Design a protein. Structure first.
Length: 258
């Protein structure tokens, strides 16, 4: 296909929850658009200063009225969200995914994705990487590796509060598997009820390039396989290597996705 000059603005909003292929999708969208895609890893590696800003936004988010019409309070919140996303061509992952409705309003020419997978595979992945149960010994290892990266209690608070926001819960028993499974199913159902079908592509792990590229009117990247990264097995190795070497820079050459 011909090469065309793409605008550096949000063109793709992925509502998919963490551990549904968001990092592979981030990589895929950066391969297509050659500009950055938001993801929690963007906060960890490039924008830790953004943590307080997302926390502030979530704290105020209850004041949004879904437009149209646009209220004064909503405009003020939307401006802060636009600022956070300046320079990016897409959003994935926490903390953005719960804002998909608001991002659709801010970026009316953006298209919407939803990544989904088997609910029990999702929970298992979530418990291995993001939210281990309180009494799980692996939680202490995760926390020890995270400190190497400069991640503290505010990072965990952002994960919790952005998951609460996505699930529209005032509080959440994070150790309750049944609650998380029910929230997962309700969240994915509500996305599909909310986004006009013409504007939504539902992706399942394994779908690869073709449905995505068709939806985005781009050629399939030539000779590049669809990304397959961020497995919980690989995250466990990362945590263990951070613990062992006590720096990211000492080991990053061993993790080509970082
Ligand atoms: O929610 N919004 O921000 C919203 C944005 C737009 N379009 C934006 C794109 C650039 N200009 C305004 C149109 C309508 C609404 C709300 O109905
Ligand atoms: O899915 N994730 O990765 C995810 C992990 C968390 N929370 C914390 C809890 C445990 N800690 C493990 C870990 C260490 C280093 C990296 C690195 F690769 F970014 F360096 C990634 C994960 C991260 C929160 C949200 C997401 C959504 O993306
Ligand atoms: N192309 C692909 N095909 C199959 N699974 C994929 C994939 N890309 C990512 N995944 C899976 O998606 C999950 C990561 O999601 P995220 O990037 O949102 O955190 C991992 O699940 P597992 O933890 O079950 O391995 C990973 O293995």
């Amino acid at each position: 296909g011909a090469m065309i000059e793409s605008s550096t603005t949000i063109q793709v909003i992925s509502a998919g929850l963490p551990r549904t292929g968001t990092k592979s999708l981030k990589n895929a969208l950066e391969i297509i658009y050659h500009k950055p895609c938001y993801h929690m890893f963007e906060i960890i590696f490039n924008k830790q200063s953004d943590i307080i800003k997302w926390q502030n936004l979530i704290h105020d988010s209850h004041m949004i009225t879904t437009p149209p019409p646009l209220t004064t309070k909503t405009i003020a919140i939307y401006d802060k969200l636009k600022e956070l996303l300046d320079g990016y061509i897409a959003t994935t992952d926490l903390p953005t995914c719960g804002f998909y409705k608001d991002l659709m309003n801010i970026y009316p020419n953006a298209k919407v994705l939803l990544t989904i997978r088997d609910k029990y595979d999702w929970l298992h992945s979530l418990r291995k990487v993001v939210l281990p149960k309180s009494n799980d010994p692996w939680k202490l290892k995760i926390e020890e590796g995270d400190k190497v990266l400069g991640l503290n209690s505010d990072f965990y608070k952002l994960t919790e509060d952005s998951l609460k926001f996505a699930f529209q819960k005032d509080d959440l028993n994070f150790d309750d598997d049944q609650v998380l499974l029910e929230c997962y199913d309700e969240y994915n159902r509500l996305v599909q009820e909310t986004v006009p079908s013409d504007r939504l592509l539902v992706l399942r792990l394994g779908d690869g390039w073709e449905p995505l590229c068709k939806f985005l009117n781009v050629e399939i990247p030539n000779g590049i396989d669809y990304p397959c990264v961020n497995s919980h097995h690989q995250m466990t190795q990362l945590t263990e290597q951070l613990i062992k070497y006590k720096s990211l820079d000492a080991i990053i050459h061993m993790f080509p996705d970082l």
